[PDB]
Ligand binder design. Structure first.
Ligand SMILES: OC[C@@H]1O[C@@H](O)[C@@H](O)[C@H](O)[C@@H]1O
Ligand SMILES: [Ca+2]
Length: 562
């Protein structure tokens, strides 16, 4: 078509790409790991890699259960992947009942098997296994369901996923079998780092095939979101990935659709949507991001003996995620025959029921001045979210929408909470106009005090898990300051919300070690903004004396040591 607004570099993409509003408004999507690995249903979806590692538990399990590596390899699961009870409409009904707004089936995982109608990859679900275009059928059901269709690609790791099959007698050593990839060594680098060391993680043919892979996905299914696994960020792969990004963003312009890319590291927060695997953020992040996590604690694909999270665990993390500008991409793992388990069906249905009542606080919302208050901050970071926090009613998460304030208690109480973030020191002319709990017909009795807004819970729980107060208020509110260390100084970050219908001007003052920095800020009516300040010539960050002022009212001082 010739559309070439986007060139294959980060400056070009940053000049013209904007994370779309639909992703910020959507908040919630369903991930679905399903493939050949679902047949053995043992360990996890990494079965293909570990079965060829002689001595590994999965290897020893496979030899006894299915046979030696030379007689029964991973490819030999494919005839057993018949998917006799797969029905795209049934999957979409479950996703829709969860309240999710977009769906991300796995188009191809690490194992080499394309779950779509591929041209270059003969190991695909149209010619083999299910003998149907799983991705295509899901795309169709998604459109009828009225949701947005995405998909994930994990093919970058296929270059090295089968490396151990070269080090022991196996069918992987037959290099004419393209399913098993380039058989390279795993790239070096611990965790979410672009460093690859002595093993690049890809080669010329795998990069060429990656582009063939993404191009046909783009061209055939026009997904509104493409999610990529961690290795696309390794340094030797980045030129190839930027080629993909420009082609996707250019194609999207032709579609009159705005699209989303997910990576876990290696690319700027502003040119794609940052994603954290099995973990969330501890702070409000400037740019929209995504937690992708599984209902199963052990695995993404179905495996016998999976320990599924509770709805309370997931919904508490969900609210925490949304309060910090994040989306939740929640994974289910259906049985090999195409059946979503009843436990994971129940988890999604419970979330959907909660969202039916409390969705006004979630859909279309944005972070407030501060995401959370209370004693229990919760988990944060890569591979931390299997731990469940024991929240109280005092653990509160905030969102905002249409100038309304939503304060979500992560547990119940027969008494009252006090919203400390509305304490008088953070406020200027804050007047509470109304308080209600979503889904409750009981008039909420509340009282503004110097320590914050005291709110008494109603008699009856509208829902379990989490409970939402909708607050209409005027006035200006500032967050407590966040201090970050830099060279010879410190960075101060607050957020200010003007809930008034009139424009407001606001003065913030940071006094650090005698150095006084001030900024006057014009905040339009019914708006909020970041305010970053810097105190320089600070000789010791650990020994700082700090005072912060909101229009000459003391908001914070670090009166206590270290
Ligand atoms: O975020 C999803 C997860 O990403 C990677 O860790 C994969 O190796 C794993 O199988 C799963 O897909
Ligand atoms: Ca809870």
């Amino acid at each position: 078509k010739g559309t070439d607004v986007f060139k294959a570099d980060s400056a070009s993409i940053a000049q013209n790409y904007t994370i779309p509003e639909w992703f910020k408004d959507a908040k919630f999507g369903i991930f679905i790991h399903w493939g050949v690995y679902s047949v053995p249903a043992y360990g996890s979806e990494w079965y293909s890699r570990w079965m060829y590692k002689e001595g590994h538990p999965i290897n020893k399990y496979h030899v006894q259960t299915y046979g030696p590596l030379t007689k029964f390899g991973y490819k030999d699961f494919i005839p057993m992947f018949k998917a006799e009870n797969f029905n795209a409409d049934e999957w979409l009904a479950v996703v829709k009942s969860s309240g999710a707004q977009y769906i991300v089936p796995v188009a191809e995982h690490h194992d080499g098997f394309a779950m779509y109608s591929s041209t270059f990859n003969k190991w695909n679900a149209v010619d083999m296994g299910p003998k149907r275009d799983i991705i295509g059928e899901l795309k169709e059901a998604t459109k009828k369901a009225g949701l947005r269709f995405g998909l994930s690609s994990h093919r970058c790791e296929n270059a090295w996923f089968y490396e151990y099959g070269m080090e022991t007698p196996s069918d992987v050593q037959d290099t004419t079998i393209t399913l098993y990839g380039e058989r390279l060594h795993e790239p070096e680098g611990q965790g979410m780092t672009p460093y690859c060391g002595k093993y690049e993680g890809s080669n010329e043919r795998s990069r060429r095939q990656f582009l063939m892979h993404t191009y046909e996905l783009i061209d055939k299914y026009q997904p509104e979101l493409i999610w990529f696994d961690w290795t696309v960020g390794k340094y030797p792969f980045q030129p190839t990935f930027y080629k993909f990004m420009a082609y996707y963003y250019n194609s999207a312009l032709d579609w009159n659709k705005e699209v989303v890319v997910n990576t876990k590291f290696g690319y700027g927060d502003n040119i794609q949507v940052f994603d954290i695997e099995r973990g969330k953020s501890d702070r409000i992040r400037e740019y929209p991001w995504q937690t992708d996590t599984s209902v199963g604690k052990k695995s993404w694909s179905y495996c016998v003996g999976e320990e599924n999270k509770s709805p309370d665990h997931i919904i508490d993390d969900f609210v925490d995620i949304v309060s910090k500008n994040g989306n939740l991409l929640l994974n289910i793992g259906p049985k090999a025959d195409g059946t979503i388990t009843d436990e994971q069906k129940n988890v999604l249905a419970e979330i959907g029921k909660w969202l039916k009542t409390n969705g006004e606080a979630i859909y279309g919302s944005r972070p407030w001045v501060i995401a959370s208050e209370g004693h229990n901050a919760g988990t944060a970071g890569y591979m931390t979210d299997n731990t469940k926090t024991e929240y109280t009613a005092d653990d509160i998460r905030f969102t905002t929408c249409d100038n309304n304030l939503y304060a979500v208690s992560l547990a119940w109480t027969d008494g009252s909470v006090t919203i400390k973030s509305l304490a008088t020191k953070y406020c200027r002319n804050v007047e509470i106009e109304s308080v209600e709990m979503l889904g409750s017909s009981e008039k909420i009795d509340y009282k503004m005090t110097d320590e914050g807004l005291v709110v008494n819970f109603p008699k009856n729980k509208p829902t379990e898990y989490a409970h939402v107060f909708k607050i209409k208020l005027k006035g200006v509110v500032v967050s407590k300051p966040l201090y970050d260390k830099v060279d010879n100084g410190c960075l101060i970050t607050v957020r200010v919300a003007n809930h008034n219908a009139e424009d407001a001007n606001v003065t913030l003052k940071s006094v650090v070690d005698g150095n006084e920095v001030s900024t006057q800020v014009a905040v339009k009516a019914k708006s909020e903004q970041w305010v970053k300040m810097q105190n320089k010539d600070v000789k010791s960050f650990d020994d700082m004396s700090c005072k912060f002022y909101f229009n000459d009212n003391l908001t914070y001082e670090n009166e206590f040591k270290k």
